[PDB]
C-alpha cells in the first residue's frame, strides 16, 4: 500500500511529463514564429532557393516521379504554419502548409495551394495517433491530364487503371491524399508531409548551404 | 520428440576438433517466432502460407579464454495449407577473429554445425511459437503486454497489489492461458530443405576490427566463395540425396567463368544459376527471399523506395545488384543455394546441452552483442568476449559455459573411425 | 540584374539567414532551459516514489540494452546494488554551464564482504576546444570510489606496476569496468574507460529521464515480451 501508492504516483508523474512535452513544444513553436518570418523574408530574396533545396533532398526525390520536377522547379514559396499556435485544440504536430508555384506559361498554372494535416486519434492503435488531411484543390499541368484523375475517362480500362495510378503517385496526387483510404492514395503521403514539417521547412537553409558546398566540389 | 537421442551438438563438434584439446562453445537460440513470409507474396498466387516460423541459431567457439569463431544461421519453417511444408536454412555469416593459437579446421567446424542444424526435427520449432500478434482483448483480467503504456502498466501493478498483495497473476501459468498465448503446428520430419548463402567479403564482420589484427587472414571474394563452396559441396555429399539441386552464381560474371569454378566440386550436380522460382514473369520482387542483413533484401528495399519493384526482373536484378556500389560485391561476390531432401529423417529435438534459449529477444541480443559488439583490433577483445559470456551466463542464467574435448587426428587408424565408434555402441547398447 | 547588385542582394540575405540561425540556436537553449526548470519539481516528486520501490534501479539497468555494452558483465553484481541515481543539471544553478552539463550521484547498497556501501558523485561539463567549433566535448575529473574486493587484481590503486607488461594488461581490464568509468575524464584518449562520454549521456539523456519506461517493460506478464513496445505492400 506504500508500494502501490508509489506506482500511482509515478503514473501521475509520467503524465505530468506528457503535459510538459506539449507545453515546451508550444513554447518553442512560438519563439520560432517570428524567426521563421524573418528568415522566410530573406529566403524570398533568393529566387531559386526552393528549386535548389528540393533537387538536393535525397528522400524527397524518392516520393515523387522524375517527371514532377518540371513543376517542383516552379515552387518559390513554402510556408508551414503550426496550427496548435492558432488553437489549443490541435496537436502540436498539426500544421498547414502553403506552396506557391510560378507555373509554366502554357502548361502549368501559377497558383497558391494550402493543405492541412492534423493528427487523428485511434482506438489503442494510435501511437500518438496518425496524420490525416483532406483533398485540397490544385490545377494539374496540361500535360498531366492524360493522368489527371478529375480528367480521366475510366479507371477500369487496363489503360485506365494504369494512368490513375501514375497520377496518384505524382506530387499532385499527394494533394488529394487524406490518409484515410489505404492503398488508394499517394504512397506515404504522411511521410512526405512530416518530411516538410520536420525536415525540409525547418532546415531548408542548411540544405541550401550543403547544396552549394556540393556544387563547388 | 520425448524419446532418447544419440547424436548431440557436443558430439558433432568434438568429432571435428583436435584430439585432446579443450574448447568451450556457445549455442544460442531464439524463441521461434511467427513472422512474415520469406518471399514477398503474389497478391494472386498459386498457394498462400498457413504460417511462417523463424528461429535464429548463433554459435561461438572459445579456446583458452578467448572467443575465435562465430556462425549466424536463421532457420525458417514454412507451412502451407495444401502444399505440404519446407525448411530453409539461411546461413547469414561465419567469421573468425584470428585469435586461436592452435590450428583447427574452421571449414569442418562450420560444416559440422550445419549438419547438426540439418539433423534437427522441424517440429522442434513448432511446439510453442511466439505469435506475431497476441490478442489480449479476449483475456480477463488485464494483462501487462508489449503495448501497455508505462502509466497503464503502473496502474495495473497498483490495482493488483491492492487486491492481491502481489503483482503476479497465477493465471498466466494456467493451462487456458498457455494454449491461447502460443501457437503450435505439426508437419512431416522429412521435408524439402533449402540452404541459402551470400558470400561477400564486406559481410564478414562478426568480429569488428579483426582486420586490424595481423594474425587474421582476411579472404577476398574469390577465396571466400571457394571456402564456402567446399563446405556446401561436402554437405551435399554427406547429407543430401544425389538428386539435390545445387546452384552457384556470381552476379555480373558470365556463366562460363562461374562454370569454371564448379569444376572443383566433388558433388556432381552443381549448376550455374540459383534455386529461386520463376513467378510473375521472373519479376525479382516475387522470387527473391528477404533475409536479415542480406544484400538481396537490401536492394529489394531500395527498389521498393524507387518504386521500381515492377521494373526489375531476376536476370536484371543480379546485374543491377553488382552495379550499385552501395551493396559492394566488388570482389567477385556470389550466391549459393541448395534444394532437396536429406538422407536421414531429422529426428532430433535439441536438449539443454545443445542450446540455450534466453528468456526474451532482449536477453538473446544482450548475450550475442557481447561477442559481435566487442572490438578485436587487439587480443584483449577476444578475452573480453569470453569473460563477459562466461560471466553473464553464470550470473543471469545460472549456467556455466559448456566444455568439450576434441577427438580427431590424422587417421592412421586400424579401422574407419565411423565403424569404430559404432562397435563401442554395439557393446554398450547390446551389453554382451 | 547587375551581376554586382545581384551578388550583393544575396550577400545581404545570406547575412540575414546566418543572423537567423543564430536566433534559432539561442532559442534551442532557451527551450532547453525552459524544459529543465519545469522538470526539476517533477523529477523530485518522481524520485521520491522511486525510493519507495526497492530494486527499481537494479531492474531498470538490466532493462536498458546498450548500457550492458559499456561495462563488464561481471559489473552487474555491483550495478544490482545501486538504489539511487540523481542527476542535477548544472545550467540551472548557473548560466555559465552548457545545458548538457550535470552532476550525477549514485548510491550503492554494497555487498557483504565484497563491495562497500557508498555514495559517489561525478560531474560532466562540456569543454570547447580551441579552433574547433564542435559544440565542444563532455569531460569530467576522477571521483574516488572504493572498488569491490573481487576487483583487487584489476584495481588501479592495488596493481604494482602499470608499466610492466602484465601490470598494463590488468589495468586496461579494470578500465572497462564501471569503476574505471568513475576515473574517466575524457582528456586522455585511449588510456581511459572506453566511451565514458557515450555512457554519461546515456544516463543523462535516457536512463535517468526515462527510467520509469524501462521499469514498466520489465513488468510484462510474458517473459518473451519483456521488454518491447508494439516486408512490403507493393501495389498502390
Give me the residue spans of the domains in chain A. Answer: 1-217
Q: How far is CA A173 from the centre of its chain?
A: 13
Say how many residues make up chain A.
Answer: 217
Pairing of strands B245-249, B270-272: parallel
DSSP state of B377: S
Given 3-state DSSP classes, what are the helix, strand and coil percentages for chain C, each rounded to the nearest 5?
50, 15, 40
Print burial letters for B215-229: b (CB count within 10 Å at least 16), e (below 16): ebeebebbebbbebb
Distances (CA, A) of B23 to B16, B107, C230: 12, 16, 40
Strand partners, A171: none
With beta carbons under 8 A apart, name residues in chain A contacting B143. none
B20: left (phi over 0), alpha (psi -120 to 50) or beta: left
Cell of B215: 594474425
CB-CB contact of B88 with B115 (8 Å): no
CB-CB contact of C148 with C115 (8 Å): yes
Residues of B serving a catalytic function are 294
Q: Where are the beta strands (DSSP E) in C66-215?
A: 82-89, 102-108, 118-127, 137-139
The domain of B269 spans 1-432
- Burial (CB < 10 A; 0-12, 13-18, 19+), residue B326, is exposed
In whole angstroms, what is the distance from residue A61 CA to residue A54 CA? 8
3-state secondary structure of B71: strand
Strand partners, B24: B62, B403
In whole angstroms, what is the distance from residue B18 CA to residue B390 CA? 23
Cell of C126: 562540456
In whole angstroms, what is the distance from residue C204 CA to residue A18 CA? 18
Centre a 10 Å sphere on the Cβ of residue B431 and count the other Cβ atoms it contains: 6
Centre a 10 Å sphere on the Cβ of residue B382 and count the other Cβ atoms it contains: 27
**CB atoms C233 and A183 under 8 Å:** yes
Pick C223's closest partner by Cβ from B37, B310, B359.
Answer: B359
Chain B: give the shortest CA distance to residue C63, in Å: 8
CB-CB contact of A55 with A80 (8 Å): no
> What are C's interface residues with A at a Cβ cutoff of 8 A?
9-10, 12-13, 16-17, 20-21, 23-24, 27, 30-31, 34-35, 38-39, 42, 45-46, 48-50, 52-53, 212, 233, 235-236
With beta carbons under 8 A apart, name residues in chain A contacting B157. 4, 7
In whole angstroms, what is the distance from residue C123 CA to residue C104 CA? 6
Chain C: give the shortest CA distance to residue A6, in Å: 5
Q: How far is CA B49 from the centre of its chain?
A: 21
Phi, psi at B21, each rounded to 5°: -135, 140
In whole angstroms, what is the distance from residue B147 CA to residue A124 CA? 9
- Burial (CB < 10 A; 0-12, 13-18, 19+), residue C92, is middle
In whole angstroms, what is the distance from residue B256 CA to residue C113 CA? 71
**Cis, bond preceding B50 (omega within 30 deg of 0):** no
In whole angstroms, what is the distance from residue C236 CA to residue C232 CA? 11
**CB atoms A11 and B161 under 8 Å:** no
Please enumerate, by residue number, every residue of B annotated as part of a binding site: 94-96, 103-107, 198, 202, 217-219, 227
Phi, psi at A85, each rounded to 5°: -70, -35
In whole angstroms, what is the distance from residue B45 CA to residue B42 CA? 5
Number of Cα atoms under 13 Å in the Cβ half of residue B266 = 9
What's the reported resolution, in angstroms, to a tenth? 2.7
CB-CB contact of B71 with B113 (8 Å): yes
Cell of B348: 532430433
DSSP state of C3: H
For cell 492524360, what's the residue?
A146
With beta carbons under 8 A apart, name residues in chain B contacting C168. none
Task: With residue B73 as reference, give the H or E element that holds it.
Answer: strand B66-80
Chain A: give the shortest CA distance to residue B155, in Å: 6
Please enumerate, by residue number, every residue of B annotated as part of a binding site for acetyl-CoA: 94-96, 103-107, 198, 202, 217-219, 227
Q: How far is CA B215 from the centre of its chain?
A: 27
With beta carbons under 8 A apart, name residues in chain B contacting C176. 384
**Pick from C202, C38, C46: nearest CA to A22:** C38
3-state secondary structure of C195: coil
In whole angstroms, what is the distance from residue B290 CA to residue B348 CA? 28
Q: How far is CA B239 from the centre of its chain?
A: 17
Q: How far is CA C219 from the centre of its chain?
A: 25
Nearest residue on chain A to B152, alpha-carbon basis: A11
Task: Kindly compute the dihedral angle of the four CA atoms of residues B187, B193, B199, B203, in this order, to the nearest 10 degrees.
Answer: 10
Cell of B154: 503502473
Q: Where are the beta strands (DSSP E) in A48-175?
A: 75-82, 95-101, 111-120, 130-133
Number of Cα atoms under 13 Å in the Cβ half of residue A195 = 15
Cell of A30: 512560438
Give the angle B376-B377-B382 at the CA atoms, nearest 5°: 30
Cell of B332: 567477385
**Pick from B372, B295, B360: nearest CA to B90:** B295
Residues in CB range of B397: below 8 A, 6 or more apart: B356, B358
Pick A169's closest partner by Cβ from C20, C34, C236.
Answer: C236
- Chains linked to C by 3 or more Cβ pairs within 8 Å: A, B
**Cis, bond preceding B192 (omega within 30 deg of 0):** no
CB-CB contact of B407 with B420 (8 Å): no
Pairing of strands A111-120, A95-101: antiparallel
3-state secondary structure of B317: helix
With beta carbons under 8 A apart, name residues in chain B contacting C69. 369, 373
Cell of B279: 513467378
Residues in CB range of A120: below 8 A, 6 or more apart: A129, A130, A131, A132
Chain C: give the shortest CA distance to residue B153, in Å: 6
In whole angstroms, what is the distance from residue A201 CA to residue A209 CA? 14
Cell of A63: 516520393
In whole angstroms, what is the distance from residue B85 CA to residue B87 CA? 7
In whole angstroms, what is the distance from residue B19 CA to residue A26 CA? 71
**Pick from B271, B272, B292, B295: nearest CA to B284:** B295
Q: Where are the beta strands (DSSP E) in chain A?
A: 75-82, 95-101, 111-120, 130-133
In whole angstroms, what is the distance from residue A12 CA to residue B155 CA? 9
3-state secondary structure of A18: helix
**Pick from C80, C86, C141, C88: nearest CA to C108:** C80
CB-CB contact of B197 with B227 (8 Å): no
Domain count, chain B: 1
Nearest residue on chain A to C25, alpha-carbon basis: A32
**CB atoms C34 and A16 under 8 Å:** no
Distances (CA, A) of B75 to B33, B80, B267: 11, 16, 24
Cell of B68: 575465435
CB-CB contact of B152 with A8 (8 Å): no
For cell 534501479, what's the residue?
C57
Pick B151's closest partner by Cβ from A4, A14, A62.
Answer: A14
Amino acid at each position: 500500500n506504500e508500494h502501490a501508492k508509489a506506482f500511482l504516483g509515478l503514473a501521475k508523474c509520467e503524465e505530468e511529463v506528457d503535459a510538459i512535452e506539449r507545453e515546451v513544444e508550444l513554447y518553442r513553436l512560438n519563439k520560432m514564429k517570428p524567426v521563421y518570418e524573418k528568415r522566410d523574408a530573406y529566403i524570398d530574396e533568393i529566387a531559386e532557393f526552393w528549386k535548389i533545396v528540393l533537387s538536393q533532398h535525397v528522400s524527397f526525390a524518392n516520393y515523387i516521379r522524375a517527371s514532377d520536377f518540371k513543376y517542383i522547379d516552379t515552387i518559390d514559396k513554402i510556408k508551414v504554419e503550426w496550427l496548435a499556435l492558432e488553437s489549443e485544440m490541435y496537436d502540436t504536430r498539426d500544421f498547414s502548409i502553403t506552396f506557391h508555384f510560378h507555373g509554366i506559361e502554357g502548361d502549368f498554372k501559377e497558383q497558391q495551394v494550402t493543405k492541412v494535416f492534423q493528427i487523428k486519434k485511434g482506438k489503442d492503435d494510435q501511437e500518438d495517433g496518425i496524420l490525416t488531411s483532406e483533398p485540397v484543390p490544385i490545377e494539374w499541368p496540361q500535360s498531366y491530364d492524360s493522368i489527371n484523375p478529375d480528367l480521366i475517362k475510366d479507371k477500369r480500362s487496363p489503360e485506365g487503371k494504369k494512368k490513375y495510378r501514375q497520377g496518384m503517385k505524382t506530387i499532385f496526387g499527394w494533394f488529394r491524399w487524406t490518409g484515410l483510404k489505404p492503398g488508394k492514395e499517394f504512397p506515404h503521403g504522411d511521410s512526405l508531409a512530416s518530411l516538410f514539417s520536420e525536415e525540409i521547412y525547418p532546415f531548408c537553409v542548411k540544405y541550401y548551404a550543403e547544396a552549394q558546398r556540393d556544387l563547388e566540389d | 520428440g520425448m524419446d532418447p537421442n544419440s547424436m548431440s551438438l557436443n558430439d558433432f563438434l568434438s568429432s571435428v576438433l583436435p584430439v585432446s584439446e579443450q574448447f568451450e562453445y556457445l549455442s544460442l537460440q531464439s524463441i521461434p517466432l511467427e513472422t512474415h513470409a520469406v518471399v514477398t507474396p503474389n497478391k494472386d498466387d498459386k498457394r498462400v502460407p498457413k504460417s511462417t516460423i523463424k528461429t535464429q541459431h548463433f554459435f561461438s567457439l572459445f579456446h583458452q579464454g578467448k572467443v575465435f569463431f562465430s556462425l549466424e544461421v536463421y532457420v525458417y519453417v514454412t507451412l502451407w495449407d495444401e502444399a505440404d511444408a519446407e525448411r530453409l536454412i539461411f546461413v547469414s555469416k561465419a567469421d573468425t577473429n584470428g585469435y586461436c593459437n592452435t590450428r583447427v579446421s574452421v571449414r569442418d567446424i562450420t560444416k559440422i554445425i550445419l549438419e547438426f542444424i540439418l539433423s534437427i526435427d522441424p517440429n522442434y520449432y513448432l511446439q510453442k511459437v511466439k505469435p506475431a500478434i497476441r490478442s489480449y482483448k479476449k483475456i480477463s483480467p488485464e494483462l501487462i503486454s508489449a503495448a501497455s503504456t508505462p502509466a497503464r502498466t503502473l496502474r495495473i501493478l497498483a490495482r493488483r497489489l491492492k487486491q492481491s498483495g502481489s503483482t503476479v497473476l497465477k493465471e498466466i501459468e494456467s493451462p487456458r492461458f498457455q494454449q491461447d498465448l502460443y501457437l503450435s503446428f505439426t508437419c512431416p520430419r522429412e521435408i524439402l530443405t533449402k540452404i541459402c548463402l551470400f558470400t561477400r567479403p564486406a559481410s564478414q564482420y562478426l568480429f569488428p576490427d579483426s582486420s586490424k589484427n595481423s594474425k587474421k587472414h582476411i579472404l577476398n571474394g574469390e577465396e571466400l566463395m571457394k571456402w564456402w563452396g567446399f563446405i556446401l559441396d561436402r554437405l551435399l555429399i554427406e547429407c543430401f540425396q544425389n538428386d539435390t539441386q545445387a546452384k552457384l552464381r556470381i552476379p555480373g560474371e558470365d556463366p562460363a567463368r562461374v562454370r569454371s569454378y564448379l569444376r572443383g566440386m566433388k558433388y556432381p550436380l552443381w549448376q550455374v544459376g540459383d534455386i529461386f522460382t520463376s513467378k510473375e514473369n521472373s519479376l525479382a520482387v516475387y522470387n527473391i527471399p528477404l533475409f536479415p542483413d542480406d544484400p538481396k533484401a537490401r536492394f529489394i528495399h531500395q527498389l521498393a523506395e524507387e518504386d521500381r519493384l515492377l521494373k526489375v526482373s531476376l536476370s536484371s536484378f543480379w546485374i543491377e545488384l553488382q552495379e550499385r556500389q552501395e551493396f559492394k560485391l566488388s570482389v567477385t561476390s556470389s550466391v549459393m543455394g541448395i534444394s532437396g531432401y536429406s538422407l536421414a529423417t531429422p529426428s532430433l529435438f535439441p536438449s539443454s546441452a545443445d542450446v540455450i534459449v534466453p528468456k526474451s529477444r532482449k536477453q538473446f541480443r544482450a548475450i550475442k552483442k557481447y561477442i559481435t559488439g566487442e572490438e578485436y583490433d587487439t587480443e584483449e577483445g577476444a578475452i573480453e568476449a569470453f569473460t563477459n559470456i562466461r560471466d553473464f551466463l553464470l550470473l543471469r542464467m545460472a549456467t556455466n559455459l559448456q566444455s568439450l574435448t576434441g577427438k580427431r587426428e590424422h587417421r592412421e587408424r586400424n579401422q574407419p573411425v565411423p565403424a569404430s565408434n559404432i562397435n563401442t555402441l554395439a557393446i554398450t547398447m547390446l551389453k554382451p
